[PDB]
Amino acid sequence: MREIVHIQAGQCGNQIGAKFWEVISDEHGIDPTGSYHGDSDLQLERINVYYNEATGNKYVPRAILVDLEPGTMDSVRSGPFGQIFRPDNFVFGQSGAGNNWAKGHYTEGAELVDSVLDVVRKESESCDCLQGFQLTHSLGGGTGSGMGTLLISKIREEYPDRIMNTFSVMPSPKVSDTVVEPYNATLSVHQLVENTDETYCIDNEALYDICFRTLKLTTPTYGDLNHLVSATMSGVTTCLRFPGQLNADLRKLAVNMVPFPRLHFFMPGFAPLTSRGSQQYRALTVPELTQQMFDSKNMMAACDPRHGRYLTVAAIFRGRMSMKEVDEQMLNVQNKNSSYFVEWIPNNVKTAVCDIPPRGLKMSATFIGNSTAIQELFKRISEQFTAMFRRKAFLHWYTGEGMDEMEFTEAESNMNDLVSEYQQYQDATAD
Amino acid sequence: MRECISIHVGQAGVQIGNACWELYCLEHGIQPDGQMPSDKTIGGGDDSFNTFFSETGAGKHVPRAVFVDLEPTVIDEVRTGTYRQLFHPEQLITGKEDAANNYARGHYTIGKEIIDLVLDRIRKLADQCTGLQGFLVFHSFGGGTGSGFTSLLMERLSVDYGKKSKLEFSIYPAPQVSTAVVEPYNSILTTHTTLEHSDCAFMVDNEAIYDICRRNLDIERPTYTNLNRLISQIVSSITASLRFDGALNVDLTEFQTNLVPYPRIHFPLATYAPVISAEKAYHEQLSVAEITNACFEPANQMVKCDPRHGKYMACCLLYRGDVVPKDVNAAIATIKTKRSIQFVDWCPTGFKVGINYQPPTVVPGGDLAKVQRAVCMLSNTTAIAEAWARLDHKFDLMYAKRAFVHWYVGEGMEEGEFSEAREDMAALEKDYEEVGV
Amino acid sequence: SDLGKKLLEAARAGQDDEVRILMANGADVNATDASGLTPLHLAATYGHLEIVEVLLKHGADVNAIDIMGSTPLHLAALIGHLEIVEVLLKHGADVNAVDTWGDTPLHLAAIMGHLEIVEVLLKHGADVNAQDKFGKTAFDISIDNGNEDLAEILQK
Numbered sequence A: 001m002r003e004i005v006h007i008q009a010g011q012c013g014n015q016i017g018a019k020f021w022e023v024i025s026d027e028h029g030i031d032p033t034g035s036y037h038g039d040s041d042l043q044l045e046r047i048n049v050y051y052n053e054a055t056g057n058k059y060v061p062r063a064i065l066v067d068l069e070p071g072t073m074d075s076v077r078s079g080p081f082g083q084i085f086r087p088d089n090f091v092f093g094q095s096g097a098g099n100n101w102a103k104g105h106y107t108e109g110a111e112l113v114d115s116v117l118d119v120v121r122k123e124s125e126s127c128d129c130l131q132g133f134q135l136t137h138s139l140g141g142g143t144g145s146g147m148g149t150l151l152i153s154k155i156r157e158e159y160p161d162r163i164m165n166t167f168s169v170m171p172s173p174k175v176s177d178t179v180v181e182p183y184n185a186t187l188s189v190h191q192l193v194e195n196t197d198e199t200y201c202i203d204n205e206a207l208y209d210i211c212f213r214t215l216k217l218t219t220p221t222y223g224d225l226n227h228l229v230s231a232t233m234s235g236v237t238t239c240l241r242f243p244g245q246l247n248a249d250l251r252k253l254a255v256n257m258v259p260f261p262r263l264h265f266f267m268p269g270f271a272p273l274t275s276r277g278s279q280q281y282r283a284l285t286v287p288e289l290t291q292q293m294f295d296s297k298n299m300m301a302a303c304d305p306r307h308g309r310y311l312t313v314a315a316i317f318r319g320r321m322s323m324k325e326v327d328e329q330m331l332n333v334q335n336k337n338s339s340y341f342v343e344w345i346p347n348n349v350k351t352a353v354c355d356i357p358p359r360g361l362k363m364s365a366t367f368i369g370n371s372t373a374i375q376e377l378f379k380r381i382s383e384q385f386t387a388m389f390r391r392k393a394f395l396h397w398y399t400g401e402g403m404d405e406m407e408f409t410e411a412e413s414n415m416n417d418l419v420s421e422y423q424q425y426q427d428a429t430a431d
Numbered sequence B: 001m002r003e004c005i006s007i008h009v010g011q012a013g014v015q016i017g018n019a020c021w022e023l024y025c026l027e028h029g030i031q032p033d034g035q036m037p038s039d040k041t042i043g044g045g046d047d048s049f050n051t052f053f054s055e056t057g058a059g060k061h062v063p064r065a066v067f068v069d070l071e072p073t074v075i076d077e078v079r080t081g082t083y084r085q086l087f088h089p090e091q092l093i094t095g096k097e098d099a100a101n102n103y104a105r106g107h108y109t110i111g112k113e114i115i116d117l118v119l120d121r122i123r124k125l126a127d128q129c130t131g132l133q134g135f136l137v138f139h140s141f142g143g144g145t146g147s148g149f150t151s152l153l154m155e156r157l158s159v160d161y162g163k164k165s166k167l168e169f170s171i172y173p174a175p176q177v178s179t180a181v182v183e184p185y186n187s188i189l190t191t192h193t194t195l196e197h198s199d200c201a202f203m204v205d206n207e208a209i210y211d212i213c214r215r216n217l218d219i220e221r222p223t224y225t226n227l228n229r230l231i232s233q234i235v236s237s238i239t240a241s242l243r244f245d246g247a248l249n250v251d252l253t254e255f256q257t258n259l260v261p262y263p264r265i266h267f268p269l270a271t272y273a274p275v276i277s278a279e280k281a282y283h284e285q286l287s288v289a290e291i292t293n294a295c296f297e298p299a300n301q302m303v304k305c306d307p308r309h310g311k312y313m314a315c316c317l318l319y320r321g322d323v324v325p326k327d328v329n330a331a332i333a334t335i336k337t338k339r340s341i342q343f344v345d346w347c348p349t350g351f352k353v354g355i356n357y358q359p360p361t362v363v364p365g366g367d368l369a370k371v372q373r374a375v376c377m378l379s380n381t382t383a384i385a386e387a388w389a390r391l392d393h394k395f396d397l398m399y400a401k402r403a404f405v406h407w408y409v410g411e412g413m414e415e416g417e418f419s420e421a422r423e424d425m426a427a428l429e430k431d432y433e434e435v436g437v
Numbered sequence C: 001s002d003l004g005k006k007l008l009e010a011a012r013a014g015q016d017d018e019v020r021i022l023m024a025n026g027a028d029v030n031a032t033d034a035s036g037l038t039p040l041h042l043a044a045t046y047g048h049l050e051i052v053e054v055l056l057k058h059g060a061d062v063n064a065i066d067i068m069g070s071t072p073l074h075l076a077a078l079i080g081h082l083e084i085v086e087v088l089l090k091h092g093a094d095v096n097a098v099d100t101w102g103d104t105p106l107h108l109a110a111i112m113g114h115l116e117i118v119e120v121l122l123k124h125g126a127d128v129n130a131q132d133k134f135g136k137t138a139f140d141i142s143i144d145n146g147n148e149d150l151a152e153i154l155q156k
């Protein structure tokens, strides 16, 4: 289990995907040139997981860039690390998706889907032992959502033995451009339930509320939100990119955090919260990080862990700190708060330590929770979907592209079936 | 020669294996490149250390050892470590994709891509043996390789070597160091499918070793290297009789005779004393009486349980160093004047004794002090059913909701195997209840 | 030559000039499609403000309901067309009209997070104790899904 193939689809997918490379690249000492100018060789021991080696002592991300709108490849190539992606791995159309899931899933995205698969096959046949795939996308748009779910399904059919893992941004009125997003997200969630092994729910509602109320940014920008997404994505993948034992590869993490196949939607969090460049702070200590890590205000999914029960939890501390300093605290959380961890999964909170901290901070902690409180996120989406669907608003947009009205009622029933499954295990007892 | 082949499976098995063979090499005066200047024989021989070491014409002593993992990370360290030149390079066998803490992957899907190669390599070792006794197998309970592949290997070794003995050293999981929540499942699954293929199995509770490292060696955060070294000195005490002249447990057959009255209840408890920190190099001698009495204090046990609340079926004392037999006999004499050690009706309520007068070896760079005398007590008591019960209770809680079961049925296993494995473990628990009045 | 169906679709599509022509030839301004929607319903759904306004100056029933009980204000408040919300209110839209799911315009504006439309509706006397047929008020909706911005606007 060595190589990971990263894919980014749509404007949100490619934007947050780019921020991911800019950040992990600097932790790994790779410059915009692919030349490694780092300061230690733990940055190299496991760099094959996300980078290919290009024979001139250069490093190339194992990344595929996809979007039906050509506008945003102009975008990414412009970025700080714009010119280190393989030009041949830019698969872009000219007609966009128009924020329409059906267009991305069925018509314009389906015309481009196997051009994308060709590049995935090229990447995968060069891997010694491919672990699986990592997709970054939005669920509220048309390309990231529609085509992204199509790509998941067809990648699944071609690589049934590998792990599929997604970083899915959920729509929110606080940040939204259109009212059709509950349609696109509800149609997307249906395919994520069936065809993904792990999904990180990065809720734009939570990202906005964090910037708006805790970091006191009057008008959050997309770049403000992505600063939080970049740090989360960097934290949750620390154990994949650095020598470790717990959660060391994509399948080992999945085996530990997913007790039931469909309940694989995680609620990520991260401490401390900084704003872009204002990060200089007092220090923070181990007891504080532990409690901020488990704090609702620190999650990037707009749900209260206190309103449900943890099925599994993964914690990643970063930086030079006392570890059993850490092991006293995270065992204290569990016994004082015994009622919020299910009794029928013993030892369901695992702790990892990585001595390499992120840029700008000497100590950090990342939270990965599989909580039954995640129902709140899907119930929020289900209510908006139903509100629109009951008045059948703008369904002509979807039917006109070759989709059926009963796929909407089916999506509605599958989201609600997911909701019911969580509440079933939230009330269950060891007995 | 009456050879013994050691097989190490999974990370825990491999890394414990490399600790042991390091220790063996020091006890037998073998150098990191295989050379032993203290050996008169030209390029071979029939000494007792030849049961564990083959000999080549250049005077190179080669472990009769196999290292197997389904990913290369750990075994790659053996290939490049201090003892890179000691082992048969073809006996270091790896895949590329591990079992992801999934018994079903280790025993059914991933494990069976490499099982036939593993057996052909063991055959090769067995074909260099004058009179192969059997195998010592190291593995963890909670790893997908440690549980699944190990169980698959034991089933195959039974078919191709029906005559030979098989001994287990199994790492019993502990939350302190546990990497996965499904370790209780894997523990039950392998125990069930392995029970009928193993003649005797020594469980090593990682929590017990963890506590000893903290309490006796004053180590804040025990590392695997810390636990391994301590474990490999307990393992050495148990295999010393096979590699040295002695009168107790001289071959694998005798392990069964002395420790296992009935085939199913074959998990002896090991207790080891003294464990003294290397910072106390000027500690005063502990007598035969004191280290013998320390073998009945729960703190020094390898598996957490209460022998005083159980009943003994067998007890063997393996002393090392400056140990006068008459002092041993008098130490036992007072031990049998303690009413809390009950024996079953149907067995001789005495203690078998062996003494190896070499002073115990400890690794340079370890955390243990050098001692003049040490003892490893191997006792088959019914108290060890408490350890199975702890695992069974965890198994029951998760399997009640079928948590994580899909991972297993998706990798070649039938769901019915859970319940039958748990029924076999329920039958084992009542096996212990029936033996213990 | 019935112009009702073509007035409906011109209003849906935002064809402001065709809207004026068709009314000039006697097109039924309160024509209904199969579901009971009127041109004003469809202009309000799709954000066609000037077609909303013109229909209101030529006899459109601002409080017409389709078979599901939806009024133009419902859909404008659901889709988030603030200017159209206020035009409809100045022409006497029933701010507390109830559809067949028990929803009022405030409920729909609350679900979809149209906070400015929430405030406009409140200033025009939206009933904060109006329950949907699950017994939920607009405030219950903001508590249940943790919308702190919406909850603060509703307690004022």
Ligand SMILES: Nc1nc2c(ncn2[C@@H]2O[C@H](COP(=O)(O)OP(=O)(O)OP(=O)(O)O)[C@@H](O)[C@H]2O)c(=O)[nH]1
Binding pocket: B009, B010, B011, B012, B013, B015, B016, B069, B070, B098, B099, B100, B101, B102, B106, B140, B141, B142, B143, B144, B145, B146, B147, B171, B172, B173, B174, B177, B178, B179, B183, B206, B224, B225, B227, B228, B231
């Ligand atoms: N004493 C000791 N225990 C270990 C060591 N390494 C791992 N363990 C324990 O063994 C269990 C995990 O199983 P592993 O051996 O690591 O897994 P594996 O056998 O390689 O099989 P895979 O799941 O495919 O990797 C846990 O209980 C760990 O605490 C070690 O070096 N020494």
Ligand SMILES: Nc1nc2c(ncn2[C@@H]2O[C@H](COP(=O)(O)OP(=O)(O)O)[C@@H](O)[C@H]2O)c(=O)[nH]1
Binding pocket: A009, A010, A011, A012, A013, A015, A016, A067, A097, A098, A099, A100, A138, A139, A140, A141, A142, A143, A144, A145, A169, A170, A171, A172, A175, A176, A177, A181, A204, A222, A225, A226, A229
């Ligand atoms: N966090 C974040 N969300 C985004 C970004 N760009 C678009 N979105 C969100 O994604 C949705 C729009 O989907 P989009 O990616 O633009 O359409 P697509 O190109 O078809 O995938 C809305 O919910 C937006 O809030 C971004 O840069 N960051």
Ligand SMILES: [Mg+2]
Binding pocket: B010, B011, B069, B071, B098, B143, B145
């Ligand atoms: Mg392993």
